[PDB]
Amino acid sequence: LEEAPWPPPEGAFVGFVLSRKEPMWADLLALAAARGGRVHRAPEPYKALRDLKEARGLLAKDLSVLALREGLGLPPGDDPMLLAYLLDPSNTTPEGVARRYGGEWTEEAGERAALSERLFANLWGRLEGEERLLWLYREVERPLSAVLAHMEATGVRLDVAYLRALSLEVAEEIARLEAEVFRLAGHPFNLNSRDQLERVLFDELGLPAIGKTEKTGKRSTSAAVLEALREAHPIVEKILQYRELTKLKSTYIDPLPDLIHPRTGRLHTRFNQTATATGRLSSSDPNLQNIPVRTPLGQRIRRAFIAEEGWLLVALDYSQIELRVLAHLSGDENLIRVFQEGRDIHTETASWMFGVPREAVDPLMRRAAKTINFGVLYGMSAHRLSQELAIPYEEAQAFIERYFQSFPKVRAWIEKTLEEGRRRGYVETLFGRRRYVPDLEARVKSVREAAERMAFNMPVQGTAADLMKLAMVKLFPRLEEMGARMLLQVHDELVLEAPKERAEAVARLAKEVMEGVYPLAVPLEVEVGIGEDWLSAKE
Template identity: 45%
Template sequence: MNDEGFGKGSHLHLIDGSAFIFRAFHALPPLTRKSDGLPIGAVAGFCNMIWKYINDARGSDAPTHVAVIFDHSSKTFRNDIFPDYKANRPEPPEELRPQFPLTREATVAFNLPSIEIRDFEADDIIATLACQARELGGRVTIISSDKDLMQLVGDGVEMLDPIKGKPIGRDEVFEKFGVYPELVADVQALAGDPTDNVPGAPGIGVKTAALLINEYGDLESLLARADEIKQPKRRQTLIDNAEQIRISKRLVQLDRETPIDFAMATLEVKDPDPEVLMEFLNRMEFRTLTKRVAERSGTTAPEPLAPPPEAAAPAAPQFAPVDCDAYETIRDTAALQRWLDAIRERGMVAVDTETTGLDEMQADLVGISFCTEVGNAAYLPLGHVEGTADLFGGGAQAAGQIPMDQALAMLKPVLEDPAVLKILHNAKYDWKILARLGIRMAPVDDTMLMSYVLNAGLHNHGLDELAETYVGHRCQPIKALLGSGKNQITFAQVPIDAATRYGGEDAEITWRLWQHFRPQLPAAQVTTVYETLERPMIEVLAGMEMAGVQIDSQHLSRMSGAFAQKMAALEEEAHGLAGGKFNLGSPKQLGEILFGQMGLPGTKAGKSGALSTSADVLEDLAAEGHELPARILDWRALAKLKSTYTDALPTFVNPDTGRVHTCYSIAGAATGRLASTDPNLQNIPVRTDEGRRIREAFLAPEGRLLVSLDYSQIELRILAHIADIPALKQAFADGIDIHAMTASEMFGVPVEGMDPMIRRQAKAINFGVIYGISAFGLARNLRIPRAEAQAFIDTYFQRFPEIRAYMDRTTTEAKAQGFVRTLFGRRIHTPGISSSGPAAAGARRAAINAPIQGTAADIIRRAMIRMPEAIEGIPARMLLQVHDELVFEADEAAVEPLIAAAREVMAGAADPVVHLSVPLVVDAGSGRNWAEAH
């Protein structure tokens, strides 16, 4: 952890925010906001408790640093240890759930740091921060009376009951548990905790547990000497339940190494901004507290907000409770027409489709959900069958459904109406499902992409996670409807009533998320990114995915056979080098041979203590001349190509189209790069013979050719522009070999007649520096000593000081605002950049690379979006995107016009938003297969 700004004399207050919420909720009578009925009782109590805390925390012993800690969700790493952990706890009351996000918003309004971490409880975060603060020489006060936190009390750490105002020290802990803090977890492990479903030792309570621990010293000593206990029943209980007790200890012991991705200095106490705080309190309609803040700050309280007129859109709908039982099932054309009329009048609708599977090219439509305002959603069943149908259909059509053709004919005019906005989550999926049925939805908004442009790098963007994070609602899991394993059914077999609750919920959550995210786009200055780089990609990618690509399955089958023979030969060679047979795919067996039998040096992998056989380790050993690691690497490379491509690709051929249809993830990588799945076509090796042979399996149909257009060194060009490096910019402008030029600049050798090895070294540094390569990594890539690699890097930065200045500038920016931006304004968050250790180094490398890689991703997105119009009229279509490359299929006679049009679009893709100071060069080729074209 970065300890700058925190140390001796610092006093950290850690507020148990989750405990504040539940105490406030249960202590106050139900309270709703008058304007819209939103439950706000817990928020009101929470705000009053925080206000009291702020006023009390003054004087000579006031905190210098403070944070409010929350539970992220109910599931944590403890559920992996013991699946039934907290299983007895009831779900939060329905009226409390929408108040969770409001308490976070309140915390920010009070200008207090709000902290929660996925997979860890608030208590773990408090434990970690308390221990780290103490190690840095500071004092800690935990604002809570939670007994689970009492194991932290000790030198430099105390607790304070926020209600009684009573300090809790070591003596108070002993009074409660009969032991001092360092043994509290041992007592809790024995006694168990029915509230959290911690099993403990049956029949042993806190008093008995304390007596036993005090007598034997600690839990492990007690369990080791359990047979010495004189009381038979107690003795047998400990012997029979020893493992259960140890598991209980792991459940109650606080994790003091929770991953913290911020510096302690960022928790420095700051006064609330009265205007910000009063705006929030006024919006919540907390009149009294708003006046108190105004009086304290010497300002005037804002006028109460006028209640919205009845005809206006609902206020703050994202925080209202979700009632899945209120949704309508549309069973006849009259009801459907009523909904379609309402949708046209509203001018917008949230839409969600339910299907028989996840493959949009083969799944059948089962039903469609609509939502036009909070609480007003409906489900239109279309393809439900009676319950006994198998996975491939064949069951009788369930009663109460409009015929599919009739319903689609009624839906088509509305879903294609440009005056009606369709709001979806992961819209590309639904767009393809409906496009296969003749409906091309437009215009479309996508809440997944809104979350992506606002929060890239912070969390994932799935509907369930966003619902819990931003709406305070936990969606019904799909497994609850479909089951799993051999008993799994399709959505077509789900009863229509249950489908209505599930589908209506998805549509309403999508509606709420839209109302939450849409207003944030301009405030975060990402409206242009969303409108010009995200929304248009939905239809572009959908068209590419539906087009698919033709493959030669027989060619791949022959390659699989050849790979199998090569792997068998490598396996036999490895057995000979090892002196006996072993499983080459077993890290354990390989480790025993390399580090045990052969005595090679190794490094431990993670917490397991086992010696690593990772690719990095094997590459280092191979570089030192050891043959067995080299053979293992060759075998692994072939095994991966065989399983991932030559064996797997034919299984992805669509039986209806005879082509392979990959799926692109728009909101995957934080930088804006697309990811390809099912199958992944973006990781086929480019520079190996095997990779080229796999590309030979991607074919053009008779009379057509595949055409590839690829940006040349686009990331180095962007680096030259963004870091303003005159030497690199001039080289690119003059069309000089950039790697040879770099070698010449670094090593003082002429470009003409240059030793290829020197150019290779410069190339490795040119590309490596973009990704923050270390001397260790460069040494491995070039097979040279680390000191020599470090000397290369030092020389590089001396010759190109602008790159170091860019790195320092970008890191400072990322630390200051928590994100970096591409040249087109894409926001990429950089969590962890202010932490310490390897995680911080990785976050720094990611922050430096993000504007470069992200800008390259934005440029090719802009090219893809412009491409359909540019090649309109040319008998060609865009099939694939592989990072900096676009692959097309075109009539043989259309290849040259296609290349000319596509090259012009790609070369000018940055204009007019960004005027690059280096030219974008696009290489092009064509052929009967992808290898020939690339």
């Protein structure tokens, strides 16, 4: 390409190099742009950023987040990564996409700009004719990238002092558990080392080994195994409590306060748009989609996520989302009728499980039923189910027979989906997002059946994901107009931040936008909560 002075003309593709992957923390090392056979290199990247009207190129959202951090309103535009991910969601990295669609991902900004330009041309070509994928790109993925940039740059407030204090408390409890374990083992060892623990449990205390690990065939010390052995020796429950506390301390309590940004005073995650096989987003550095909520200590951590003073959090959650999506995709009259009547399958299964009418099913019972309903729907074996519910095998095989007896068109949909997957090589969501599943015709049963369960799950999980992304795209401009902010997405949950005086109005509006995002054969229902912290806002 011909070397030309900065700045580039409008519509140019950008290339950039960062000192590290996280754009909120990165130094912008180099910046360049490519258009019309020319490459333009920025003499000073930060100042040069002000010359761009949009970020158009590979990883555009990352550059946009960095620009927002610097107080510039530079939105992301076209990004070849999003095109490639739509063609085939195994396209997740710039390295892989480059090699596959016509270049090499290097560490030089000018080369990255030229690459962005060539790849976009190539991928745009592959998408011609693909009307549904083009719709997803134009109506969902491309504008969602702008919404995600704002969310990343905004971050979320965390009560640092509270977490520091909590760390000290938890450390003391860990010491008490550790001391007791060692006493019961008759010697100290590294309780964090599963290899060392395996030897104490199975070789020294002589407990029965229940299971083996996948890759290396060691005797497993997983929670499922320890639960099975909690009556066999008092050390086992102490180990389970130790695991719970150290997992929470090492993963959340200790790292989180160190990730507060000096400029914002907030915690900033990355929302990865081309990371999953199904079209869900992921969250990383730190992952904020797996913040604890189950246990008492988990709930105390969830309370550390708070609104700015004078604001409130608003938490929105689609109810029974995958079952509702399944009803639409399958067209099963019975399942459809369940939701038109206002019924709850989780509650109804929890009635069966715990032996309760339908009334007085506490929230905890309902949640236990979730794993059962999802597990069974997606192909959990009758043996795992019998083991989970502590019931005879024949009662489990019967339970699954009844599950699919109640909604006969679900099986037919599953069969239909698997056949198209075998014939075409991919399966699709309601909106045409695809996932290629080559192992559907594998001659090894375990491999083939694993592929089947991935294949028929994808349209359900991915349709739910598409619906939430669409909702986020629709909701974002409405929030801006009300001075509210979108903070986090957790798959089928959204967390917003609103001025206290407008939080009620924000919640009502957000609920309506999410419920009416794309009408299905059954109503979408959204539960909404308001509070000073994440836990309080989820009621």
